[PDB]
Structures are given as C-alpha cells and as structure tokens.
Amino acid sequence: MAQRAEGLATVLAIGTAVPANCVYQATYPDYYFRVTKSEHLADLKEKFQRMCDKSMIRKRHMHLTEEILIKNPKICAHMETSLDARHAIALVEVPKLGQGAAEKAIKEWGQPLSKITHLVFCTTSGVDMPGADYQLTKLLGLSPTVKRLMMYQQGCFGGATVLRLAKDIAENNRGARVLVVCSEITAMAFRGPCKSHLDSLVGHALFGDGAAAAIIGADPDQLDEQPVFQLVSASQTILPESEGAIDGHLTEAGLTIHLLKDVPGLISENIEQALEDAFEPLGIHNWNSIFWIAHPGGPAILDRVEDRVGLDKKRMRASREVLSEYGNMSSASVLFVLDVMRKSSAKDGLATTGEGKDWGVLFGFGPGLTVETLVLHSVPVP
Amino acid sequence: AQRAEGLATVLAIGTAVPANCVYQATYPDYYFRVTKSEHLADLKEKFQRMCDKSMIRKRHMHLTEEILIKNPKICAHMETSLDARHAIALVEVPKLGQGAAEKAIKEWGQPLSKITHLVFCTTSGVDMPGADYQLTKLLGLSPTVKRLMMYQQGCFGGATVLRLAKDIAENNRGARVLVVCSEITAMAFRGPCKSHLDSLVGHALFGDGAAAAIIGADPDQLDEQPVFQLVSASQTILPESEGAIDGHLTEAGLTIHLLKDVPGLISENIEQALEDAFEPLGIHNWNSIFWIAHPGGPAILDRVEDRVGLDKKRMRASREVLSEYGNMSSASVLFVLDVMRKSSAKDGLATTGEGKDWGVLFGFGPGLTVETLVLHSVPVP
Ligand SMILES: CC(C)(COP(=O)(O)OP(=O)(O)OC[C@H]1O[C@@H](n2cnc3c(N)ncnc32)[C@H](O)[C@@H]1OP(=O)(O)O)[C@@H](O)C(=O)NCCC(=O)NCCS
Ligand SMILES: CC(C)(COP(=O)(O)OP(=O)(O)OC[C@H]1O[C@@H](n2cnc3c(N)ncnc32)[C@H](O)[C@@H]1OP(=O)(O)O)[C@@H](O)C(=O)NCCC(=O)NCCS
Ligand SMILES: O=C1C[C@@H](c2ccc(O)cc2)Oc2cc(O)cc(O)c21
Ligand SMILES: O=C1C[C@@H](c2ccc(O)cc2)Oc2cc(O)cc(O)c21
C-alpha cells in the first residue's frame, strides 16, 4: 500500500530522433526503381508513382542509403536470402537511434540516469538476444538493476502498448520512473518491387525510420518534473472479421508485409465502438471535444476515421503533420504525434498540451487487426 | 478503487509437453544418426560425456525423425532453414501454449470471460500477429483481452512474465492475467560442428514445453484458492558477463553462443541477489526458504548449491524438472513451481513451498541477466 504510487502515470518528457539521410517523396518513385534496377517494370513504377502522389508524405528519414544498397544487392531483390545482412544493420542501428531519442527525453526531464528504474524497449525491426533493451542500458549507462521489458516484433500498436505497460509499472511502484523507447529501421523490410506483392509496394510508399522515447512516472515532483500528459486508461481489441488484414513475417528475406480485406474500412467501422467503450465511463460523447493522437498508418486510415467518426479537419492535424514529415514509423509514430501536439499547442498559445482540450484519445492499429485505445488528459500551459 | 488492494497471487498452474519423448541414454546415438554425423567419432564422444553429466533422463521434442527426414536443411549445422523452422514453430508454439493454458484454466475453474490480460512468452520464432493473438483465437478469449507478446526472451522469460503479471494484477481491480511460456526446439535444432562445442551443449540440455498460470490480486474467498504470492521482483545484469550467453535469429535459425563461465558468474552473484531481495524482510538463512531455480543445467544448480551452502533438498524440485524435461527455456520455472506445490502436498507438508513461508524464484539468461522474485507460500491443510 505504501510501496505503490498514489496518482496517475504521467508523461514527463518526450524525445525523438531520425536518421540524418532524408528521402523526398516527390523523387522517390525514380530513386526506388533506379536503385533496385527495376526501371523495366514501367507499369509497376506508374502504380508506385500514384501511391506516392496519394501518400500525403513529403519526406521520410531512412538509415538505408544507395551506398549501403550497392554493398547489399540481395536487399534490392524482392525476396532473396538477406536476413543476416539486414540484422547486421538493424541490430546496431535500432538501439543507437533509440539512444538518440532517449538522450533528448532524459535532457528534457533533467533528472539523473540513476532515477530511471525501468526500461521498455519496443521495435518491429529485427530481434536478438540479449535485446535492444540490454544494448540501450549499456549505451546510456543505466543502472545494471534497471527492470527491462523487451517488446520485439510488435508492429504499429507498440507505441500504445509501451504506454499501457509503463502506466501499470509507474502506478504500482512508488518512485518508479520508466524510460520507454520505440525505434524502427526499415532496412529489415526494404526490398525491390514485384507485381505479385502490391501491398509491399504500399509499404515502400509509406514506411520510414525513427525513434521516440518518453519518461513516465506517477506522483511527479512539483518543482523538478513537468507533466505533459496523463495516462488515464488503456484498452485493446481485435476487430471482427479482420483475420489476416495485416500480417508481418520475419523470413530468410527479412520482414515482409501482407494486406488482405480493407484495413481503412475495418478500422473506421469499429473506431466509434472503441471511443464509446473508453469515454462512456467519463460521460464524454462528442468526439470533437477531445484531442486526437491517431497512429498515422497512412492517409486512407486517417481520412476514413475522420469521415466515419465526423471529425473536424483540425482533430487529425498533428497525426497528418507526422505522416507528412516522417511517414509511418510503425511503433514510434504515436510518440512523435504526442510531441507535435504539445509543441504546436504551446506555440499556438493554447491553454493545454492537448490543443486546449482536457481529454484526449490515442489509437494504435496493427496486426490482428488490433486497435489499442488510450484515454489521455492534457496539462495546463502557462 | 480502480486498482487492486492485495498482492498478485498465482491461482493456478498448468503444463504441457509434446507427446514425443526422447531418452537421454540413447540420445548421442540418435542425434549423430539423424544428423548423418557418425563420421565425427571424437565429437560424438564429447557429446556422450555432455549427456552423461546432463542429469537429464528424458526430454519432450515436437521434432521427430519423420519431420527431420522431410526437413534436411534443419539437420545441417548452418544451412538456410529459418523458413522451414518457422513453418513448424509458428504453429506448434501457440498450440503447446493452448495445452498448458487449458490445464491452468481447468484448475482455476472460472469462466474464460474473467481473463482480462494475456502475456505470452517464447524464445521459439517470431511472427505478426503474435502467438498471443493465435492463443486468444485457440482458447476463445474475449477479443478485448489486453495482450503482451514477449518474443525472443530466453530463459529468464518465466520470471519476467510473473513480474509483468504482478504489476498488471495489482494495478487493475478484477484483473486476471493468463501467463503462458511455450518453447519448441525446432528453431535451434541443428547438426554438430567441431567449431561450435557450445551448440553441442545446447543439444544435450534443451527440450520443449509450455507452462501457464493465472495471476490475480484479492482472490475471491469462495471461488479462488491461492497457490503462491508474488512479493517482489528484481532484475540485474551481472558484472563482467558481457557475451556469456548470446542467441541470434539467423537465416539458419536460432544459434546459441557461450563465451564465459556461466555457472561461475551466476554462483558468484547469487548471494548478493538473495541479500538484496531478503534483507528488507529480515531473512538470512537460505535453507529456511523454498527455491525455484531455473534448471539451466546441472552445473548452474551444483555451483549455486555449493556457494550458498544449500541442503540437497532445496534444489530437489529444480533437479526433478531438469531430469524429466531438460531446460525448456522460459517455461522451466513454472514447471518447477508446479512440481514444488504437488510434491509439497504429496509429502503432507504444511505449505505449497515445502512447508516454508518464503521462497525465491531465479531466472537466468542473456545479459547475463538474473531475475529474482520473492514468493510467499500458502497454507495446505
Ligand atoms: C496507398 C495510399 C497512400 C494512396 O491510395 P488512395 O488514396 O487509395 O489512391 P488510389 O486508390 O486512387 O490509388 C492508389 C493505388 O494504390 C493501390 N493500393 C492501395 N492500397 C493497396 C493495397 N493494400 N494493396 C494493393 N494495392 C493497394 C490502389 O489499387 C491504386 O492502384 P492504381 O492507381 O494502379 O489503381 C492509401 O490507399 C493508403 O493510405 N492506404 C491505407 C493505409 C494502410 O493500409 N496502412 C497500413 C499500415 S499497416
Ligand atoms: C554441459 C554439462 C552438462 C557438462 O557437465 P560437466 O560436469 O562440465 O562435465 P565434464 O566437464 O566432465 O565434461 C563436459 C564436456 O562439455 C564441455 N563443455 C561444457 N560447457 C561447455 C561450453 N559452454 N562450451 C564448450 N564446451 C563445453 C567440457 O569442456 C567437456 O568436454 P570434454 O569432455 O572434451 O572436456 C555442464 O557443464 C553444464 O551443466 N553446463 C551448463 C550450464 C549452462 O551454461 N547452461 C546454460 C543454459 S542457458
Ligand atoms: O513489414 C513491416 C514493416 C515495419 C516497419 C516499419 C517502419 C520501420 O522503420 C521499420 C519497420 O512495420 C510493420 C508493421 C506492421 O504492423 C506489419 C508489418 O509487416 C510491418
Ligand atoms: O538457442 C537457444 C535455444 C532456446 C530454446 C530452448 C528450449 C526450447 O524448447 C526452445 C528454444 O533457448 C535459448 C535460451 C537462451 O537464453 C539463449 C539461446 O541461444 C537459446
């Protein structure tokens, strides 16, 4: 009873990092078909051009350069034996990018490394033992007694999952300060285009690299810590009739994506039930009276959710800015959206970190099809 | 009032193994025959001495000679074989987990609708959606079950799922956590090689198994009967242990690397783990507590027994699991917990923990990581 915290798990800091290499969407169909030596696939290239034109992405950050692809031609093939070459990149770069994000969150938070009691590391980009959690513990110099959770092969709802894990840890352990880190490197999934896998082609229009980190704790110090958001509740559901809508396989040829059914339609037709299950207990029913942190999976998911739920254009603005500037960074994306939301809220002189609203919703979407729903509370901005 | 009041408790434990049983006495001959490695006579003699010292009687293995004949790339030391291994393990991991979970759910006796959370742990393959999703479908759990998928975890995973379940169960009023650890050696099984004697060690020790438990805080007085209480959970990276246990998921499947004195590293650090866990409770006699030690192999249990000064009885449940199942990675400690309460009841002892009040559970794995849980027994009539 005295070993547990009293109040709600709170986000006390958010930091983000991306590879320096920036790939512009306007020139990407030419780049992708040239470096994979696929320019004879002219009809496929035109299909890819239309996907990039509709993507609502301006740029992505990618560790993978043409120099790396030239040294790894089997990564350029659609489905060649290449997992070992991909792991040799991702098992180093995932924790290093995570280090970049974690250092920025720790600097914002301003407390000593010794106060971090727990680490949750989440990725979809390769697996190893010991894990990225161990590697980051060594890179940052965390205490050897840090309690670690290594969340591997999670997918796009992982950002929601690490907040749900951190909420229970922070609330149940007095003094606990949880470092959460999501880090994604597309070198695990990047491959040449193929007419038989148009879903892989969609992935190559959307997926980017990035890492995000947060410090989560309950009972924040009034003077030395600064709340950004509160984590109120977390729910998860498998959508009806969604079997196989999003599958991801780690194979001899790296990570491959498989899409069936209508992912935007399945999510959009179930989202209102997720909102009601989360918000009815709080007496909230106007979805325009809350701020929105939607996983920016792609423009069709944000468009169909906005349309079906009846959102004003401003609700999806922060999610769309992440999509525009970074693409889909799988598990890291929602932490980027949280960061954009609080920064743009303060910049626009609004009264709270959540666009001047009190209550907010965070959605992750991924394989299952799984929807993770978190209720958030904003904090006042001076 | 959204949070639980009391301690996370184990309310049920179930286990399952593949029916295929491989006897250790005949295993060096079987292993060298099915990997077509009979020309490696000096390697076979080294393997025979590893099996003789293993203190394993039998292991359960999904992989049969019929499956190995259909998958010759798996029999080579290092051929491209991850896809063939995944085709087996991505189906059998959740299916074996189902077997363990159904037995724990039967012991518990509550409706499936009471299960609010699922934690699935494996070291045997990865996929999206995960084994957590597959098991949700196999059991008929509610679509609103809150899942944690713990992939590529290693031998401390059994301790980690209890640490996770403790925080979930204590922080969520009414929460009932199903935890499942399930391991299939099809991911790691390969032919022998003179350059990789640590792989030979793995082939002497690793077996298949799944274990499940139901965890909850504030057990219903009428409907639920506790087995063990989860008091505290700690984790540490051992000093000077960099590279002691590495595990790579490669084009050729899961490969193990041992690059130190694993038994010496664990035994040199275990007393400090005991003191960190038990000094706050005023406990100093390590023979006054029950022991749930990950049966990583006989040298770990021997060196810990020797360094800490344990009576032979303390490691008995851990050695029975090693004997009857081998090292089942993350599942092993839940097998030991089950053996401990069953043999405690059979011997007419006054608690689930060999008649003791307090116990310790240790997982060991890559890092080198040691996970330490403090347990409390419950009275037995
Ligand atoms: C791809 C995308 C950015 C642009 O598509 P759009 O706005 O629908 O535009 P259009 O449908 O007019 O054209 C896009 C092309 O992509 C194709 N396409 C879209 N989704 C596809 C899929 N899953 N598999 C195959 N092709 C697909 C269309 O068939 C079309 O090809 P065409 O021009 O040769 O007919 C958009 O469809 C999208 O956001 N997709 C959903 C997001 C998503 O699935 N996220 C998953 C992340 S896990
Ligand atoms: C393998 C084991 C059963 C053999 O028992 P033992 O008492 O060491 O037996 P011996 O020393 O008489 O012989 C064992 C043989 O295995 C070899 N061996 C043991 N551990 C080894 C390792 N990590 N790498 C390579 N060879 C190893 C020994 O050198 C010896 O070979 P030899 O006959 O050519 O000298 C025992 O050492 C053990 O329990 N080790 C496992 C502990 C462990 O690391 N488990 C990790 C799982 S996570
Ligand atoms: O195949 C992939 C790629 C992966 C990914 C994206 C961005 C990044 O930087 C790294 C990995 O995200 C995914 C997320 C899924 O739910 C299913 C998937 O199949 C995949
Ligand atoms: O390579 C393996 C095999 C794996 C395993 C054991 C039993 C089983 O049934 C399935 C997988 O356990 C491990 C545990 C480790 O800490 C490191 C490892 O490298 C491995």
PDB file of N, CA and C and ligand atoms in Angstrom, chain A residues 124-125 155-156 184-186 189 207-210 246-249 255-258 328-330 365-367, chain B residues 128, ligand 3:
ATOM      1  N   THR A 124       9.951  -3.270 -34.190  1.00  0.00           N
ATOM      2  CA  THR A 124       9.443  -4.210 -35.210  1.00  0.00           C
ATOM      3  C   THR A 124      10.626  -4.586 -36.123  1.00  0.00           C
ATOM      4  N   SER A 125      11.827  -4.096 -35.833  1.00  0.00           N
ATOM      5  CA  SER A 125      12.997  -4.077 -36.745  1.00  0.00           C
ATOM      6  C   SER A 125      14.100  -5.015 -36.260  1.00  0.00           C
ATOM      7  N   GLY A 155       4.881  -4.254 -34.078  1.00  0.00           N
ATOM      8  CA  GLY A 155       4.071  -3.587 -35.116  1.00  0.00           C
ATOM      9  C   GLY A 155       3.599  -2.219 -34.674  1.00  0.00           C
ATOM     10  N   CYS A 156       2.644  -1.631 -35.400  1.00  0.00           N
ATOM     11  CA  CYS A 156       2.326  -0.202 -35.264  1.00  0.00           C
ATOM     12  C   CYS A 156       1.582   0.110 -33.964  1.00  0.00           C
ATOM     13  N   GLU A 184      12.629   2.147 -34.906  1.00  0.00           N
ATOM     14  CA  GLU A 184      12.276   1.395 -36.132  1.00  0.00           C
ATOM     15  C   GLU A 184      13.255   1.771 -37.241  1.00  0.00           C
ATOM     16  N   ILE A 185      13.759   0.761 -37.956  1.00  0.00           N
ATOM     17  CA  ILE A 185      14.745   0.908 -39.063  1.00  0.00           C
ATOM     18  C   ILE A 185      14.219   0.027 -40.211  1.00  0.00           C
ATOM     19  N   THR A 186      13.876   0.642 -41.338  1.00  0.00           N
ATOM     20  CA  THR A 186      13.204  -0.012 -42.499  1.00  0.00           C
ATOM     21  C   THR A 186      14.163  -0.942 -43.249  1.00  0.00           C
ATOM     22  N   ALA A 189      12.894  -4.466 -43.820  1.00  0.00           N
ATOM     23  CA  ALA A 189      11.735  -4.671 -44.718  1.00  0.00           C
ATOM     24  C   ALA A 189      12.048  -4.196 -46.148  1.00  0.00           C
ATOM     25  N   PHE A 207       6.491   3.600 -45.270  1.00  0.00           N
ATOM     26  CA  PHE A 207       7.271   3.322 -44.027  1.00  0.00           C
ATOM     27  C   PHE A 207       8.565   4.142 -43.998  1.00  0.00           C
ATOM     28  N   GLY A 208       8.830   4.774 -42.843  1.00  0.00           N
ATOM     29  CA  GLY A 208      10.078   5.500 -42.570  1.00  0.00           C
ATOM     30  C   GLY A 208      10.731   5.071 -41.287  1.00  0.00           C
ATOM     31  N   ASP A 209      11.891   5.638 -40.982  1.00  0.00           N
ATOM     32  CA  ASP A 209      12.671   5.280 -39.784  1.00  0.00           C
ATOM     33  C   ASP A 209      12.472   6.368 -38.738  1.00  0.00           C
ATOM     34  N   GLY A 210      12.600   5.996 -37.484  1.00  0.00           N
ATOM     35  CA  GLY A 210      12.507   6.963 -36.383  1.00  0.00           C
ATOM     36  C   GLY A 210      12.529   6.263 -35.062  1.00  0.00           C
ATOM     37  N   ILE A 246      -3.685  -7.612 -41.665  1.00  0.00           N
ATOM     38  CA  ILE A 246      -2.271  -7.148 -41.631  1.00  0.00           C
ATOM     39  C   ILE A 246      -1.419  -8.265 -41.032  1.00  0.00           C
ATOM     40  N   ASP A 247      -0.556  -8.893 -41.825  1.00  0.00           N
ATOM     41  CA  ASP A 247       0.376  -9.949 -41.360  1.00  0.00           C
ATOM     42  C   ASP A 247       1.794  -9.438 -41.668  1.00  0.00           C
ATOM     43  N   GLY A 248       2.742  -9.820 -40.829  1.00  0.00           N
ATOM     44  CA  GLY A 248       4.148  -9.430 -40.996  1.00  0.00           C
ATOM     45  C   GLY A 248       4.995 -10.633 -40.642  1.00  0.00           C
ATOM     46  N   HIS A 249       5.846 -11.091 -41.555  1.00  0.00           N
ATOM     47  CA  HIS A 249       6.612 -12.345 -41.359  1.00  0.00           C
ATOM     48  C   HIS A 249       8.092 -11.978 -41.338  1.00  0.00           C
ATOM     49  N   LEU A 255      11.842  -8.892 -43.225  1.00  0.00           N
ATOM     50  CA  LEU A 255      10.455  -8.661 -42.779  1.00  0.00           C
ATOM     51  C   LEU A 255       9.567  -8.363 -43.988  1.00  0.00           C
ATOM     52  N   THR A 256       8.516  -9.150 -44.194  1.00  0.00           N
ATOM     53  CA  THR A 256       7.611  -8.951 -45.344  1.00  0.00           C
ATOM     54  C   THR A 256       6.224  -8.601 -44.809  1.00  0.00           C
ATOM     55  N   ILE A 257       5.487  -7.738 -45.499  1.00  0.00           N
ATOM     56  CA  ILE A 257       4.126  -7.314 -45.052  1.00  0.00           C
ATOM     57  C   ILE A 257       3.098  -7.951 -45.970  1.00  0.00           C
ATOM     58  N   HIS A 258       1.936  -8.302 -45.427  1.00  0.00           N
ATOM     59  CA  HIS A 258       0.807  -8.908 -46.166  1.00  0.00           C
ATOM     60  C   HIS A 258      -0.470  -8.187 -45.739  1.00  0.00           C
ATOM     61  N   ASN A 328       5.110   6.701 -41.974  1.00  0.00           N
ATOM     62  CA  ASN A 328       4.690   5.718 -40.949  1.00  0.00           C
ATOM     63  C   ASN A 328       5.943   5.097 -40.318  1.00  0.00           C
ATOM     64  N   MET A 329       6.256   5.425 -39.059  1.00  0.00           N
ATOM     65  CA  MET A 329       7.448   4.877 -38.359  1.00  0.00           C
ATOM     66  C   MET A 329       7.034   3.736 -37.422  1.00  0.00           C
ATOM     67  N   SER A 330       6.002   3.006 -37.809  1.00  0.00           N
ATOM     68  CA  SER A 330       5.498   1.851 -37.013  1.00  0.00           C
ATOM     69  C   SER A 330       5.338   2.286 -35.542  1.00  0.00           C
ATOM     70  N   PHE A 365      -2.908   0.917 -34.108  1.00  0.00           N
ATOM     71  CA  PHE A 365      -3.562  -0.021 -35.042  1.00  0.00           C
ATOM     72  C   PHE A 365      -2.458  -0.971 -35.481  1.00  0.00           C
ATOM     73  N   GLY A 366      -2.782  -2.223 -35.659  1.00  0.00           N
ATOM     74  CA  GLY A 366      -1.804  -3.170 -36.202  1.00  0.00           C
ATOM     75  C   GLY A 366      -2.398  -4.549 -36.398  1.00  0.00           C
ATOM     76  N   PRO A 367      -1.505  -5.533 -36.624  1.00  0.00           N
ATOM     77  CA  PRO A 367      -1.855  -6.928 -36.863  1.00  0.00           C
ATOM     78  C   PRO A 367      -2.870  -7.434 -35.843  1.00  0.00           C
TER      79      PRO A 367
ATOM     80  N   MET B 128       3.880 -11.845 -36.844  1.00  0.00           N
ATOM     81  CA  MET B 128       2.855 -10.786 -36.621  1.00  0.00           C
ATOM     82  C   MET B 128       1.623 -11.164 -37.432  1.00  0.00           C
TER      83      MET B 128
HETATM   84  O1  LIG C   3       6.667  -5.130 -42.675  1.00  0.00           O
HETATM   85  C1  LIG C   3       6.555  -4.241 -41.803  1.00  0.00           C
HETATM   86  C2  LIG C   3       7.494  -3.058 -41.732  1.00  0.00           C
HETATM   87  C3  LIG C   3       7.570  -2.496 -40.320  1.00  0.00           C
HETATM   88  C4  LIG C   3       8.472  -1.306 -40.173  1.00  0.00           C
HETATM   89  C5  LIG C   3       8.056  -0.017 -40.487  1.00  0.00           C
HETATM   90  C6  LIG C   3       8.906   1.080 -40.317  1.00  0.00           C
HETATM   91  C7  LIG C   3      10.209   0.865 -39.879  1.00  0.00           C
HETATM   92  O2  LIG C   3      11.122   1.867 -39.747  1.00  0.00           O
HETATM   93  C8  LIG C   3      10.631  -0.422 -39.571  1.00  0.00           C
HETATM   94  C9  LIG C   3       9.767  -1.492 -39.715  1.00  0.00           C
HETATM   95  O3  LIG C   3       6.238  -2.139 -39.865  1.00  0.00           O
HETATM   96  C10 LIG C   3       5.294  -3.132 -39.982  1.00  0.00           C
HETATM   97  C11 LIG C   3       4.180  -3.018 -39.180  1.00  0.00           C
HETATM   98  C12 LIG C   3       3.175  -3.969 -39.279  1.00  0.00           C
HETATM   99  O4  LIG C   3       2.113  -3.814 -38.443  1.00  0.00           O
HETATM  100  C13 LIG C   3       3.282  -5.046 -40.157  1.00  0.00           C
HETATM  101  C14 LIG C   3       4.402  -5.148 -40.953  1.00  0.00           C
HETATM  102  O5  LIG C   3       4.521  -6.173 -41.830  1.00  0.00           O
HETATM  103  C15 LIG C   3       5.447  -4.194 -40.878  1.00  0.00           C
END
